[PDB]
Design a binder for this molecule. Structure first.
Ligand SMILES: Nc1nc2c(ncn2[C@@H]2O[C@H](COP(=O)(O)OP(=O)(O)OP(=O)(O)O)[C@@H](O)[C@H]2O)c(=O)[nH]1
Ligand SMILES: [Mg+2]
Lengths: 230, 69, 206, 349, 395
RNA sequence: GCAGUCAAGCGUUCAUAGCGACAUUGCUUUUUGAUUCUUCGAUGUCGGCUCUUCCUAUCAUACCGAAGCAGAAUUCGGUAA
RNA sequence: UUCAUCUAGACAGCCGGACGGUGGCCAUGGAAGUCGGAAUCCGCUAAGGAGUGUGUAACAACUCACCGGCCGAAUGAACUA
C-alpha cells in the first residue's frame, strides 16, 4: 500500500454491500441512543456526558442565532491597525491572619523540648542579599521553596499584564513585623519594577519602580497576581 | 450478574442533626442577604374572551369620570 | 489600607542623563580578580543592559501560514517558497548534499561500533548502583544549604585533575541565582603535581 | 527512523489528550482522603497526584518526540521530500512547540510538589493540586493547532512508501497523459491509475521487478508541465527532488498521437529543459504509443529534435507498444543492462 | 570628503503653544510643502482641521465629511487636498479656499492608506500631478486629479496595498501585506514590471530616497515663493541632482521595512536582486527613511531602537540606545544633522546625527503621540494624535 | 490564580442599577524536536518478612466499539474483579 | 402558559419543479452551487441559495430551502410546574 490505498480500494471494488443501510440506521438510532446514555451512565460519566451535551446545545444556539443575524442583512492609523492586544485602593478590608497561621513551630532536640524556632508558612519576599544566617542563631525561617523574585502584575489600563521583578515590599496590612519580614499575603502593597510599561509624565524622566497591590493568596496557588495603581 | 454493594438509606442521627444545623445557618445567611409588578392579568384559552375587557371598560368610563364632577 | 497619595504616588523615576551616564561604563568597567563585588544599589537593568546583536532574530511564519493551509485537506498552498529557479545551482546543491550526507555517513562509519554488538543481541550490563554515590538528593540538599548559608564559596579542586573534577554546571547556577558569591578555587594536593604544573594549572585559570 | 516510518503512536487532539491523562490520574491513584488524616498523609496524597499527572503528560509527549522521523539530517532525498510534503518550517516548529510544552509541564510539577511539602491543611493542598493541574491543562490546551497538524502528517507519512535511496532504480517521468503509469502497471506488479486524464497520479508510486535474480525498483512520478521553475507544485518538486537525488536510469515518456494533449515540440522543449537534471543517469527515452501510428513517419523537425536527443553521452530512442507486453521486456532489460555497466564501474574501485 | 545639502538649522528645543481644537485622536497631519506654517489634521472622526503654527489659530478648518478620514498627504503645488479616508470614497479640497471641490471618489472598497503624486521636474510646467490611490483591498486607481476618475487599475498585489510613491524616472512604488514588492510604470496601462520577492512577513512603510524633495515640490534650504513652473521644475531637477548624486547617478534606492527583521535595501532600476542584509532589530520595525541628501537610512521600530545605516550599500553605521517603547513615525530635518522621533509614550525624542548622539527630550502630552513631519525651512513641527493635543514645536 | 470581554438567561420590568454559565484574552523565558551535565529546609517519623480477605477507579487475560485499522503491531473507549 | 399555521386545505408522507443571463469574479492541473477568498444581482415566476449536503480528478447524477399535485384535521415551536 503506497498512497490513499483505502480510497483507491473504495473506488475500485466498493464498500460492504450494506454500508449504506447500516450508516443510515445508525444515524436514525443515535437519536434514541442519546437518551439511553443520559438516563443510564451513572457516576461521572454522566457528569461528563451532561457537561458535554450542554456545550453542544450552547454551540448550536450560538450558531443559529448567528445565522439569523447573518440573514437580517477608536480609529487606529495605518502604522498601527490590524494588530491586536476618591483615593481608594482597590482592596481594603482583607481578612486577618492570626499569629498561629503563618507561624509554624520547630521543636529542637532529640527530646523535642527546646523549640524557640518558627517558620513562616506564607509566600515571602526576601530581597537580594538573603544569604541565610547561621543555624545556631536564626529564629525565623522562610524556607527557600516559599520565596518570590517576581510578580505577575496587570495594569488597569492598556489592558495588559506582565511579569515584573519585585524590588521591595512597602505595606503589609495586619502587621508591621510582617512588612519588615516581607510576607506576600493578599492585600499587601509591593514596590515592583515597572520598566516595561514605560511611563513618562510631564517632563517625565522615566519611571522604573511603582506600587502595586496583590489580589490573590499566594497559597491557594503559587503565582503572585498583583494589580498596578497608575 | 454479579451484584455490587448498594448504599444504605438509614438515618445516622449525627448526620440528621447536622442537617438541621446546616439548614438553620443557611436560613440565617439568607436573612443577611434579605436585609441587603408585572402581574399576569388574564389567562388565555378562556371562552368569554369578549365580556371581560368590556366590563373593565364599563368600570373605567365611571372610575375616570367620577373624579371631576 | 488607609487611603494615600502614595499608591498612585509614583516612586522610582530616573532621568535621561542618568541613563546616558550609566549606559556608558559597561564597556569600560575595570573588573579584575583583585576586586570583588559586595553591594548593588540597584540600577535599572531592562534599560541599562542589552548590548547589540547583529544576528537577525529568527523570522516568524505563524501569522502568515497558519497550519491548515500548510498541511491538511485545506492545504492552501501548492507552490514552494522560495521556489528554486537555477537548475544547475539546484543540482549543485543536491549532489553536494548527497556527497556531504556520505561525509557524515563516513564520520559515523569511522567512529562507530555498537550496531554490530546490537546485531549480536547482547548489551552492556547495569552500571552498579554504587556509581551513584555523589548524586543523591540527600546530598544536593546540604549542598544548597551551604550555598545559601554561605557568604562565599570555595570550590576545592584537586591539583592532579582540575579539568576533570570541575565539571561545573553549578557555577552556571551560582552566578545567576546569587552573583555576590565569588567561587574561590583551591587546588589541593598540589605536591603530587610538581611546581611546574602547579604553575601551569593556575596560570590559565586565575 | 528510516524507510516508511509507520511506527508513531497517535496524536490525540488537545481535548482528548487532556481527557486521557487527567482521567488516568483519576483512575490509577487513590481518590479518598479525609481532612482527619496526618498532614503528612494529605501532602503525600496530593503530591502523588501532581507527580503522576506530570509523568503521564511527559510520556505522552516524549513518545511523539522519539517517534517522528526528524526531518533534518536523515537523507537529502527524504529531507526535501517531507519539505515538499509537510512544510519543513511548520514541521520543525510544531515539534519544537511540543518539546517546549514538555519542559513546561515538568517544571509545573517540579515546582508545585516542592510547594506541597509545605502545605498546612487539606484545603491549601487541594488548592495547590487544582492549581498545578489547571496550569498543565492550559499549557496543553495551547497545543490545538500543532496536534491537529501532526495527526494528518502522521496519517500521511505512514502511508508514504519506502524507496531505498541507493539500490538499483529506474525512474519514469514525462508529461501527464503520456504513459508513465501504463508502463509501470504493464511491467511490474502494482496498482496505479490508467484513466485518461492529466494527473492520473499525484505522488510517487513504486514497483519492484527482478532481473538476474536481483532486485530493481521502478518509480513512476506524477510528471511536470511547462512551469519555468518559478511556479511549480508540491506535485512537481517531488519529481524534481527524485530525478535529482536518485541515481539510476531514467525513462522519458513522449508520444506522437491524439492523446497526450500537448505538442511534440513542447515535449522536446521540456526534454531540453530537464536535461540539466539528467547528470549521471544515462537516459533512455521511449518513443511510445507506437501501435497504430507506425511513427517512422515523423517530420524533419522531429528528426532534428532527436538529433538533439543524441547529444547526450548515453542515449537511446526506442519504440515500444507499451501494451504489447512482448517489447516492454526488451525495453526493461536493455535499459537496466546499459545501466549495470556504469553502476559496476562505480562498484569496482 | 562629504557633501552637506548645505544649510544650517539650529537644534529644535521649544514646544510652542499646545493647541486645542476638535477633541478627537489625530492620526496624520500634512504640512504646506512651500511655506512653513500650515498643518492639516484628520483626527479620530470624519472632520479635518487646518491650522497655522506661526499664529497658532485654526486656519479655516476643512470640515464637511461624513465618515472617518485617515491619511493626509499634501499635493506638490499647495492647491490640492486629497485625504485618506477609511470609507470607500475620498473628497478633494484646497486649503486657501477650504470649500467643497467636487464630490466623492467612488470605486474603492476599504481604507485608503497612502497617497502619491507626480514627480515635479518630470511633468509639464503648469500641469496637474495625477494620483495612483491605493486601498486595503489591493487596488491601485490612477486618477488624472482633475477628472478624479481612473481608467486602469493594476492588481499585482492581493493583500492590503499600504504604500504608494512615484519615482522620478517615471517609476512607481506600491506596497502591500503580501510580503512582496511590485513596481510598475505609466506606459504599462494595466501591467506589472518589477516583482521583488524577499520577505516572510509583510512589508510596512516602503521608503523613498526622493521623498523630501519630490514632496516639497522644488523649494530650497530657505523655501521661497516661485513664479515660473518651468524654472520651478528646473529647481526640482537641480536640487534633485544636488541630493541624489551620491554615486554620480540617481539610481533610486529602495529600502523597505519588514516584520521578519529582514531589513532589505534594493535597487530596482538595473536589477531584481537585493543588496543590503542590514539586520539587527529584535521586534517589528515600522518607520524608515532615506536622509534628504540620501546619505543614510534611518530605521525606527517597536524595539526601543534607532538605527542609521550606510546610504551607499546598506552597511551599519550607528544604533542609538535610550528608549522605553516603540518608535512610530520619524520625520527628517532640513540641516540633516538632526532627527525627531515619536516614541509610543508621551515624549518626542530628538537626536544628533552629525555626531551620533541623543540631543534632548521633549515631553508634555498626557497620552500617545502619532504624527511627526517637518517645516519647509527646517523650523517647526506639528504633533497631534491620541493626546488630542496638537502640540507645536520650534527651536 | 489574577485582571477583562462577553452574554445564555436571571434581576420591584430593569441588559446600558445589577448579576452573571459555557465560551473566551492576556505571561509564568525564547519558537526549528536546543539541552536536562539547576535536585532549594516533609517538625515528624520509616520500611519488612509470614498470612487472609475485600473494592474497581482494569496492567494482563475474555468478548465487543471507533480510529487510515491493508497484514502485523498498537491508540483510545465499553462490559468485566 | 406565551406565541403561529390551517378547507383562499395545518402536520406526516409519496410525485413533480428546484430555471435562464451565469463554467458570477479571483486564485490553478483541474475547482461547472459544494478545496479556497467577495458580494450576493436581475429576470420570468410557484418557488428556487451566485447553494444545504453525498458525491466526480472536472460537470453529470441524488439532495436541501423552496414551491405545486395527492390526502383530508390539528399541528408546530419556546418556556413553567
Ligand atoms: N495504444 C497504446 N497507448 C499507449 C501506449 N503507451 C501509453 N499509451 C497511452 O497512455 C495512457 C497511459 O496513461 P498513464 O500511464 O496513466 O500516463 P499518466 O497519466 O502520465 O500516468 P501518471 O503519471 O502516473 O499519472 C494509455 O491509456 C494510452 O492511451 C502504448 O504503448 N500503446
Ligand atoms: Mg494515464
Amino acid at each position: 500500500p503506497q498512497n490513499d490505498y483505502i480510497e483507491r480500494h473504495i473506488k475500485q471494488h466498493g464498500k460492504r454491500l450494506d454500508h449504506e443501510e447500516r450508516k443510515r440506521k445508525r444515524e436514525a438510532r443515535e437519536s434514541h441512543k442519546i437518551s439511553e446514555r443520559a438516563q443510564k451512565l451513572t457516576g461521572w460519566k454522566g457528569k461528563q456526558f451532561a457537561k458535554k451535551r450542554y456545550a453542544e446545545k450552547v454551540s448550536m444556539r450560538k450558531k443559529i442565532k448567528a445565522h439569523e443575524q447573518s440573514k437580517v442583512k477608536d480609529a487606529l492609523p495605518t502604522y498601527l491597525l490590524d494588530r491586536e492586544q476618591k483615593f481608594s485602593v482597590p482592596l481594603p478590608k482583607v481578612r486577618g491572619i492570626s499569629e498561629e497561621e503563618m507561624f509554624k513551630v520547630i521543636k529542637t532536640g532529640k527530646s523535642r523540648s527546646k523549640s524557640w524556632k518558627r517558620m513562616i508558612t506564607k509566600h515571602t519576599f526576601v530581597g537580594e542579599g538573603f544569604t541565610r544566617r547561621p543555624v545556631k542563631m536564626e529564629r525565623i525561617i522562610r524556607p527557600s521553596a516559599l520565596r518570590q523574585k517576581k510578580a505577575n502584575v496587570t495594569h488597569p489600563e492598556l489592558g495588559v499584564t506582565v511579569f515584573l521583578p519585585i524590588l521591595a515590599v512597602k505595606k503589609n496590612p495586619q502587621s508591621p513585623m510582617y512588612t519588615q519580614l516581607g510576607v506576600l499575603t493578599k492585600g499587601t502593597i509591593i514596590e515592583v519594577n515597572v520598566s516595561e510599561l514605560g511611563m513618562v509624565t510631564a517632563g517625565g524622566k522615566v519611571v522604573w519602580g511603582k506600587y502595586a497591590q496583590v489580589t490573590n493568596e499566594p497559597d491557594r496557588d503559587g503565582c503572585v497576581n498583583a494589580v498596578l495603581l497608575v | 450478574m454479579r451484584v455490587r454493594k448498594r448504599q444504605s438509606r438509614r438515618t445516622s442521627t449525627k448526620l440528621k442533626e447536622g442537617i438541621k444545623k446546616k439548614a438553620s445557618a443557611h436560613r440565617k445567611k439568607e436573612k443577611k442577604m434579605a436585609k441587603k409588578k408585572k402581574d399576569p392579568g388574564i389567562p388565555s384559552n378562556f371562552p368569554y374572551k369578549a365580556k371581560i375587557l368590556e366590563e373593565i371598560e364599563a368600570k373605567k368610563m365611571k372610575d375616570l369620570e367620577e373624579r371631576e364632577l | 489600607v488607609q487611603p494615600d497619595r502614595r499608591w498612585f504616588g509614583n516612586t522610582r523615576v530616573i532621568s535621561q542623563d542618568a541613563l546616558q551616564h550609566f549606559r556608558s561604563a559597561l564597556g569600560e568597567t575595570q573588573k579584575d580578580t583583585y576586586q570583588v563585588l559586595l553591594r548593588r544599589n540597584k540600577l535599572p537593568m531592562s534599560l541599562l543592559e542589552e548590548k547589540d546583536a547583529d544576528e537577525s532574530p529568527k523570522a516568524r511564519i505563524l501569522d502568515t501560514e497558519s497550519y491548515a493551509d500548510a498541511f491538511g485537506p485545506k492545504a492552501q498552498r501548492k507552490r514552494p517558497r522560495l521556489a528554486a529557479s537555477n537548475l544547475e545551482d539546484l543540482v549543485k546543491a543536491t549532489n553536494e548534499d548527497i556527497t556531504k550526507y556520505e561525509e557524515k555517513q563516513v564520520l559515523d562509519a569511522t567512529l562507530g561500533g555498537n550496531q554490530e554488538d546490537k546485531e549480536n543481541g547482547w548489551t552492556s550490563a547495569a552500571k552498579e548502583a554504587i556509581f551513584s554515590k555523589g548524586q543523591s538528593k540527600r546530598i544536593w540538599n546540604e549542598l544548597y544549604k551551604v550555598i545559601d548559608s554561605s557568604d562565599v564559596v570555595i570550590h576545592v579542586l584537586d591539583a592532579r585533575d582540575p579539568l576533570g573534577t570541575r565539571c561545573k554546571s553549578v557555577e552556571e547556577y551560582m552566578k545567576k541565582e546569587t552573583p555576590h558569591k565569588h567561587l574561590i578555587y583551591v587546588l589541593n594536593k598540589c605536591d603530587l603535581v610538581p611546581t611546574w604544573v602547579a604553575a601551569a594549572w593556575v596560570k590559565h585559570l586565575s | 527512523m528510516q524507510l516508511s516510518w509507520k511506527d508513531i503512536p497517535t496524536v490525540a487532539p488537545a481535548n482528548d489528550l487532556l481527557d486521557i491523562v487527567l482521567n488516568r490520574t483519576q483512575r490509577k491513584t487513590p481518590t479518598v482522603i479525609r481532612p482527619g488524616f496526618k498532614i503528612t498523609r494529605i501532602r503525600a496524597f496530593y503530591m502523588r497526584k501532581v507527580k503522576y499527572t506530570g509523568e503521564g503528560f511527559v510520556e505522552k509527549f516524549e513518545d511523539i518526540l522519539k517517534g517522528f522521523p526528524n526531518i533534518n539530517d536523515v537523507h537529502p532525498f527524504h529531507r526535501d521530500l517531507m519539505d515538499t510534503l509537510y512544510e519543513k518550517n511548520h514541521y520543525k516548529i510544531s515539534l519544537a512547540a511540543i518539546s517546549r510544552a514538555k519542559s513546561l509541564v515538568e517544571q509545573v510539577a517540579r515546582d508545585y510538589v516542592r510547594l506541597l511539602k509545605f502545605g498546612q491543611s487539606l484545603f491549601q493542598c487541594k488548592q495547590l493540586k487544582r492549581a498545578a493541574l489547571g496550569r498543565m491543562a492550559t499549557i496543553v490546551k495551547k497545543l490545538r493547532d500543532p496536534l491537529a497538524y501532526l495527526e494528518q502528517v502522521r496519517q500521511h507519512i505512514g502511508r508514504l512508501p519506502s524507496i531505498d535511496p541507493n539500490t538499483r532504480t529506474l525512474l519514469i517521468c514525462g508529461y501527464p497523459n503520456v504513459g508513465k503509469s501504463s508502463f509501470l502497471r504493464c511491467i511490474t506488479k502494482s496498482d496505479v491509475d490508467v484513466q485518461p486524464y492529466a494527473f492520473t497520479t499525484k505522488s510517487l508510486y513504486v514497483g519492484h521487478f527482478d532481473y538476474k535474480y536481483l532486485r530493481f525498483q521502478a518509480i513512476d512520478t506524477p510528471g511536470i508541465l511547462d512551469r519555468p521553475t518559478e511556479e511549480m507544485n508540491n506535485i512537481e518538486m517531488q519529481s524534481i527532488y527524485a530525478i535529482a537525488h536518485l541515481r539510476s536510469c531514467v525513462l522519458y515518456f513522449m508520444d506522437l498521437s491524439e492523446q497526450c494533449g500537448f505538442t511534440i515540440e513542447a515535449q522536446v522543449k521540456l526534454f531540453h529543459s530537464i536535461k540539466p537534471l539528467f547528470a549521471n543517469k544515462s537516459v533512455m527515452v521511449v518513443i511510445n504509443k507506437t501501435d497504430i501510428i507506425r511513427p517512422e513517419d515523423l517530420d524533419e523537425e522531429r528528426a532534428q529534435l532527436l538529433e538533439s536527443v543524441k547529444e547526450v553521452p548515453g542515449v537511446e530512442i526506442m519504440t515500444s507498444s507499451c501494451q504489447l507486453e512482448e517489447n516492454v521486456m526488451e525495453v526493461r532489460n536493455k535499459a537496466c543492462e546499459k545501466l549495470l555497466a556504469s553502476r559496476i564501474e562505480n562498484k569496482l574501485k | 570628503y562629504t557633501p552637506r545639502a548645505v544649510f544650517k538649522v539650529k537644534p529644535v528645543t521649544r514646544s510652542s503653544s499646545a493647541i486645542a481644537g476638535h477633541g478627537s485622536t489625530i492620526l496624520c497631519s500634512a504640512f504646506a510643502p512651500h511655506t512653513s506654517s500650515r498643518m492639516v489634521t484628520g483626527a479620530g472622526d470624519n472632520t479635518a482641521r487646518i491650522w497655522d503654527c506661526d499664529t497658532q489659530t485654526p486656519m479655516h478648518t476643512l470640515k464637511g465629511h461624513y465618515n472617518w478620514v485617515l491619511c493626509v498627504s499634501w499635493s506638490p503645488d499647495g492647491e490640492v487636498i486629497a485625504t485618506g479616508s477609511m470609507d470607500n470614497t475620498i473628497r478633494l479640497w484646497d486649503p486657501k479656499s477650504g470649500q467643497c471641490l467636487g464630490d466623492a471618489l467612488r470605486g474603492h472598497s476599504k481604507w485608503i492608506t497612502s497617497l502619491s503624486w507626480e514627480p515635479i521636474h518630470l511633468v509639464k510646467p503648469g500641469s496637474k500631478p495625477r494620483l495612483a490611490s491605493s486601498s486595503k483591498d489591493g487596488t491601485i486607481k490612477i486618477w488624472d486629479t482633475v477628472s478624479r476618475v481612473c481608467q486602469y487599475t493594476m492588481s499585482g498585489h492581493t493583500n492590503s496595498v499600504s504604500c504608494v510613491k512615484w519615482g522620478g524616472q517615471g517609476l512607481l512604488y506600491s506596497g502591500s501585506h503580501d510580503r512582496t514588492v511590485r513596481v510598475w510604470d505609466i506606459n504599462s496601462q494595466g501591467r506589472c514590471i518589477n516583482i521583488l520577492k524577499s520577505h516572510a512577513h509583510w512589508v510596512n512603510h516602503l521608503s523613498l530616497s526622493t521623498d523630501y524633495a519630490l514632496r516639497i515640490g522644488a523649494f530650497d534650504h530657505t523655501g521661497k515663493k516661485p513664479s515660473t513652473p518651468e524654472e520651478a521644475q528646473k529647481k526640482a531637477l537641480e536640487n534633485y541632482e544636488k541630493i541624489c548624486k551620491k554615486n554620480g547617478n540617481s539610481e533610486e534606492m529602495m529600502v523597505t521595512a519588514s516584520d521578519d527583521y529582514t531589513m532589505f535595501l534594493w535597487n530596482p532600476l538595473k536589477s531584481t536582486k537585493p543588496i543590503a542584509r542590514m539586520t539587527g532589530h529584535q521586534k517589528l520595525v515600522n518607520h524608515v527613511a532615506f536622509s534628504p541628501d540620501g546619505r543614510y537610512i534611518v530605521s525606527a521600530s517597536f524595539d526601543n531602537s534607532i538605527k542609521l545605516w550606510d546610504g551607499r550599500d546598506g552597511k551599519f553605521i550607528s544604533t542609538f540606545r535610550g528608549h522605553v517603547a516603540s518608535v512610530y513615525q520619524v520625520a527628517w530635518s532640513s540641516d540633516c544633522r538632526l532627527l525627531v522621533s515619536c516614541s509610543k509614550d508621551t515624549t518626542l525624542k530628538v537626536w544628533d546625527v552629525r555626531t551620533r548622539k541623543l540631543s534632548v527630550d521633549l515631553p508634555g502630552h498626557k497620552d500617545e503621540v502619532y504624527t511627526v513631519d517637518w517645516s519647509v525651512d527646517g523650523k517647526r513641527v506639528c504633533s497631534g494624535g491620541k493626546d488630542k493635543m496638537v502640540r507645536l514645536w520650534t527651536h
